[PDB]
């Protein structure tokens, strides 16, 4: 054996130039695509915002046109989903996470268009759903689609191009090169066996992806919290406690996100119509709150800066938290296309700010600034729910640029994964796959 | 498949006991790594104090500079060739092998030899990192607790060993992330599955990084402030720089191995001729650490200065070449100490240089040499060691200029690409593929 190794070692890191080139095209496409998707979700959330003003006089008329306009989008979304591609529904990550394990199919001739358009509708509607899902999936199906076209064989080209397209997608959705790579090699990839994935080919993809993102949406960040304070050594324990909170809570949320999935399934019983209806119903509830209380609805970003700056009273926070927990479950558990990643970023930010405000009181001698805890807990749910901290932390760090909080950011995120494990928690993305897999090897 | 469904539902559940030892391996590697760091100081200082003590007589100094350092280097190589021949060299391949079970973790030896043998080599002022000494001491600490409290299973043996490996590289660069990333990208078994608790590692690294802080906080290792940004139309300049490090990286890899052979002749394996050639090279440094501080030393002190652009283009090429030499000698002459850090210094200099030529040819890009410095700082770590994702997150943590990330990647990537197509090989892997085929005859 110590013979073969010696041979392999001398042969390490030598991915076929051909794979290293397609990675360059999967990325360029996922990027151009992810951008086009992003631009679309804009034009829509806007055309809507434009019509509320167009009739700004008549109040009830608005609450209606807000609900209607969004309901009509959500519906068109769920339709395309239940009609042509039931995988497009939900997050869209587990489907790719499964596909890497060869346990799921990558029907791109369907998913690409369904996930895309079905997404604009769900996002343009203003629902509480991320973008990762839509682009991480579209990401992969792009990989597979080039893998097939130019045709390429071997478990590598099939795992590689699929994994690079998965990452390049999560990159252009958060403008976070690193976080992309890190997500693949920590969550997406086969968790229990070896797998021939060119980590170098991935980079090439992510980069080519991130450049396209920049070429069109540069000179403006997604989140701006400026340079908050630093974390004195004697204030680190406060981040371990916060980490515990997200730790016990993370799983509880994981239960609700699954339970609601069952429960909500009743209502339409699988009926393409009752579903598409309950769709427009929830998609409308959002197009309305996206007005009466912008915080409760929407993707989640707009409010992160404001929550971190400390512009919400403690009361207003608890509300927004709870209101969100609800709106996020509905939209995601109701099998609508769109990630659940980002909305969890918003939930931690709010639960963090809150913890922050209580801290800033009990400890005047620590000269705290609520903001630190916001940024500490921002990827804490990504850690207690999805149970993939190393990615959560490098994601936040890339969007908030406050590297001096890294120690607290880790202690929080870590403590979270620790308290989530000891309380029966499970990787929310893995469970969803273990259930979509089970159910299949159930209906036999 | 059905099993997968079962496993999935069981993912990420590392035994509370492992998750606790990780906490102790880290605390120890940290306290240790700090103690080592403090020692290498007291020495480089006691020396600097004696040069002044006789500041009048010039030749006397050049001598006492050479002597004082020669006497340290020797005491270093001795402890090495005498009680633990693995302590010699970097010290990473040995742990990288140990994870593959292909090498032994003789801690009852390595800990004390690597440690004291290091203070001697570093205190001497030679061109060698600290990663090696602490990455190794790191692992041997893991194994040492693994044995003491006694723990079985391939996991606890791979985990605690891998956490102590990372916790070490963390307290050596105060870079929590880079640590974790190094394990799960280079140190870990590159061609088969391996039960390593990534969560247990974190706990280690953190506990390690806190100890580092507790003693050396309020002061960074590298301060380059906030340099400019990289306009989209200036990205290609980083691909070209990436190509340079790409063709060069392997060439350096050859010299680092060849010099290892060649230098071996001179002492022929003779514990004495070796220990002598040791103090010889260790003296050459204690002297340059005076006549030309840049050529000698660990490498940090000069990174800020090279980045700020305080060296003329001439002075750079010199320092580059002078270094390439001094770095090969000290590392190829099997002395204890990493080669990681010194490569950080080499990229910084080759970057600044590329930077200055750029700042000329393109006045319309409003460049600032510094950006290229910070871009190429982890470029060697990418063309030589061929582990970019770690190089990049390491620089990013020490330089804190996240707005350069895109250029940092394009450079580092292009490097690994140009190194591959030119037959390059993971310098850490090659050294093991030798350590292994040697133990096979």
């Amino acid at each position, epitope marked *: 054996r110590r013979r073969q190794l010696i041979r392999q070692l001398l042969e390490r890191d030598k991915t076929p130039l051909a794979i290293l080139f397609m990675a360059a095209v999967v990325g360029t496409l996922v990027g151009l695509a992810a951008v086009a998707f992003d631009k679309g979700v804009a034009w829509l959330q806007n055309q809507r915002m434009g019509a509320l003003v167009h009739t700004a006089d008549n109040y009830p008329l608005l609450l209606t046109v807000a609900f209607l306009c969004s309901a009509v989008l959500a519906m068109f979304g769920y339709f395309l989903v239940r009609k042509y591609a039931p995988e497009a529904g939900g997050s869209g990550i587990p489907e790719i996470e499964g596909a890497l394990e060869d346990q799921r199919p990558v029907r791109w001739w369907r998913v690409l268009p369904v996930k895309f358009f079905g997404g604009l509708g769900t996002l343009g509607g203003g629902m509480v759903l991320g973008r990762e899902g839509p682009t991480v999936q579209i990401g992969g199906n792009i990989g597979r689609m080039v893998l097939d076209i130019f045709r390429l064989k071997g478990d590598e080209a099939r795992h590689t191009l699929l994994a690079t397209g998965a990452a390049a997608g999560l990159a252009a959705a958060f403008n976070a090169p690193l976080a992309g790579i890190l997500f693949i090699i920590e969550e997406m990839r086969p968790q229990f066996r070896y797998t021939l994935i060119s980590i170098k080919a991935v980079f090439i993809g992510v980069i080519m992806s991130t450049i396209m993102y920049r070429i069109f949406n540069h000179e403006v960040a997604l989140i701006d919290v400026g*340079k908050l*304070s630093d974390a*004195p*050594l*004697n*204030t680190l324990w406060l981040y371990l406690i916060l980490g515990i909170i997200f730790g016990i809570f993370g799983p509880i949320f994981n239960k609700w996100v699954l339970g609601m999935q069952d429960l909500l399934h009743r209502v339409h019983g699988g009926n393409i119509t009752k579903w598409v209806l309950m769709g427009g119903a929830i998609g409308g509830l959002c197009g309305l709150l996206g007005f009466v209380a912008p915080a409760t609805s929407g993707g989640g970003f707009n409010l992160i800066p404001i929550a971190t700056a*400390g512009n919400f009273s403690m009361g207003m926070l608890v509300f927004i938290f709870v209101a969100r927990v609800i709106t996020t479950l509905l939209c995601f558990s109701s099998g609508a296309p769109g990630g659940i990643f980002a909305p969890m970023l918003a939930l931690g930010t709010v639960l963090g700010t809150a913890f922050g405000m209580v801290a*800033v009181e009990l400890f*005047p*001698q*620590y*000269h705290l*600034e609520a903001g630190t805890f916001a940024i500490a807990g921002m990827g804490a749910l990504l850690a207690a729910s999805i149970r993939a901290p190393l990615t959560g932390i490098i994601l936040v760090l890339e969007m908030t640029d406050n590297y001096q909080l890294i120690l607290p950011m880790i202690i929080t995120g870590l403590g979270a994964t620790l308290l989530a494990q000891f309380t029966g928690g499970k990787p929310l993305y893995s469970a969803i796959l273990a259930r979509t897999l089970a159910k299949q090897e159930a209906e036999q | 498949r059905r099993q997968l469904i079962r496993q999935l539902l069981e993912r990420d559940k590392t035994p509370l006991a492992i998750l606790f030892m990780a906490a102790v391996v880290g605390t120890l590697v940290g306290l240790a790594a700090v103690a080592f760091d403090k020692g290498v100081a007291w020495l480089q200082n006691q020396r600097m104090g004696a040069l002044v003590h006789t500041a009048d007589n010039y030749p006397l100094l050049l001598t006492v500079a050479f002597l004082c350092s020669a006497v340290l280097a020797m005491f270093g190589y001795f402890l090495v060739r005498k009680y633990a021949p693995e302590a010699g060299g970097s010290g990473i391949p040995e742990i990288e092998g140990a994870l593959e079970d292909q090498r032994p973790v003789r801690w009852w030896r390595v800990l004390p030899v690597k440690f004291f043998g290091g203070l001697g080599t570093l205190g001497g002022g030679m061109v060698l990192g600290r990663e090696g000494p602490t990455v190794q001491i790191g692992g041997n600490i893991g194994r040492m607790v693994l044995d003491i409290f006694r723990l079985k299973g391939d996991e606890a043996r791979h985990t605690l060993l891998a956490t102590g490996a990372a916790a070490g590289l963390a307290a050596a660069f105060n870079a929590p992330l880079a640590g974790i990333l190094f394990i799960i990208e280079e140190m870990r078994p590159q061609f088969r599955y391996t039960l390593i608790s990534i969560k247990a590692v974190f706990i280690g690294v953190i506990m390690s990084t806190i100890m580092y802080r507790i003693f050396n*906080h*309020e002061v960074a290792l590298i301060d380059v402030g906030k340099l400019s940004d990289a306009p989209l139309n200036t990205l290609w300049l980083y691909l070209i720089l990436g190509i340079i490090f790409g063709i060069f990286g392997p060439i350096f890899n050859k010299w680092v191995l060849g010099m290892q052979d060649l230098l071996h002749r001179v002492h022929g394996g003779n514990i004495t001729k070796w220990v002598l050639m040791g103090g010889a090279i260790g003296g050459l440094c204690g002297l340059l650490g005076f006549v030309a501080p840049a050529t000698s030393g660990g490498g940090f002190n000069l990174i800020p200065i090279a980045t700020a652009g305080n060296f003329s283009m001439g002075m750079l090429v010199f320092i580059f070449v002078a270094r390439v030499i001094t770095t090969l000698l000290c590392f190829s002459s099997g002395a204890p100490g990493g080669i990681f850090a010194p490569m950080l210094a080499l990229g910084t200099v080759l970057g600044t240089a590329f930077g200055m030529v750029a700042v000329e040819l393109f006045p319309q890009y409003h460049l600032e040499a510094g950006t290229f410095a910070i871009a190429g700082m982890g470029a060697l770590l990418a063309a030589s060691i061929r582990a970019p994702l770690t190089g990049i997150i390491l620089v990013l943590e020490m330089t804190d200029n996240y707005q350069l990330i895109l250029p940092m990647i394009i450079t580092g990537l292009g490097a690994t690409l140009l190194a591959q197509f030119t037959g390059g090989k993971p310098l850490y892997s090659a050294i093991l593929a030798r350590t292994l085929a040697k133990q096979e005859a």
Partner: antibody
Framework: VRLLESGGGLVQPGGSLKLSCAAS????????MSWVRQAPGKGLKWIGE????????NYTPSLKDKFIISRDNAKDTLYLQISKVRSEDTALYYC??????????????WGAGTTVTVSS | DIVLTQSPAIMSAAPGDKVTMTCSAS?????IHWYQQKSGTSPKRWIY???KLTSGVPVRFSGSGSGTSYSLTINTMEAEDAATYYC?????????FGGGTKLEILR
């Protein structure tokens, strides 16, 4: 890094003055500024303090508005407003920068200190 | 608001001579700090975090303690040590200072 304080002088019991501290030598933001005073022939007693962004100001136990502290991050100046002055306000006032090691804040750098005499 | 009580209100020592002074709290405190104050001039941060000396402070100094009693020491105190030392604490809001100790020179 220098910390200049000016504005102290003579005042009538009952009146009010505005002390000023000009900061040179360090990025005045990111810091916490605080005032400490010393009655001739007595120890040091802390008056109050303020952070960067100016969204937090704490004072020692005093009346509803006995003291008003503020800072213009723009002019690199720290002010102190004392009102309804008794003669217990007759003291030497110092401004200071605030920092820490572990996290138990100390008074980093002080200033010469201007004098306030409260008399009729 | 804790109440730190400096020890010898006043006290003189000879040049080259070990000196100690106390700062007994009225409750737990942690990593108290010490300040030096020369007639007519602004306070200086000497010892900080119970023992950690300040960048530039003369090595003859050392300070320690815990819980409720802390102390400053001059291992052979010279003249440029003749001043007034104040201990401060900020382990619990609001911060507080001691009565101060008058280190006068004996000759």
């Amino acid at each position: 890094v220098r910390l200049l304080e000016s504005g102290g002088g003579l005042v009538q019991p009952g009146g009010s003055l505005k002390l000023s501290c000009a900061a040179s030598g360090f990025d005045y933001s990111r810091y916490w500024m605080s005032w400490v005073r010393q009655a001739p022939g007595k120890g040091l007693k802390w008056i109050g303090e303020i952070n960067p962004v100016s969204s937090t100001i704490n004072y020692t136990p005093s009346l509803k508005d006995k003291f008003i502290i503020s800072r213009d991050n723009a002019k690199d100046t720290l002010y102190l407003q004392i009102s309804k002055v008794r003669s217990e306000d007759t003291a030497l006032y110092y401004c200071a920068r605030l920092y820490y090691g572990y996290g138990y804040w100390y008074f980093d750098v002080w200033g010469a200190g201007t004098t306030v005499t409260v008399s009729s | 608001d804790i109440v730190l009580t400096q020890s010898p209100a006043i006290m003189s020592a000879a040049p080259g001579d070990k000196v100690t002074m106390t700062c007994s709290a009225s409750s737990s405190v942690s990593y108290i700090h010490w300040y030096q104050q020369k007639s007519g001039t602004s306070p200086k941060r000497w010892i900080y975090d119970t023992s950690k000396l300040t960048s530039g402070v003369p090595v003859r100094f050392s300070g320690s303690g815990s819980g409720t009693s802390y102390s400053l020491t001059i291992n052979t105190m010279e003249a440029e040590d003749a001043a007034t030392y104040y201990c401060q604490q900020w382990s619990s809001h609001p911060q507080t200072f001691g009565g101060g100790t008058k280190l006068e020179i004996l000759r």
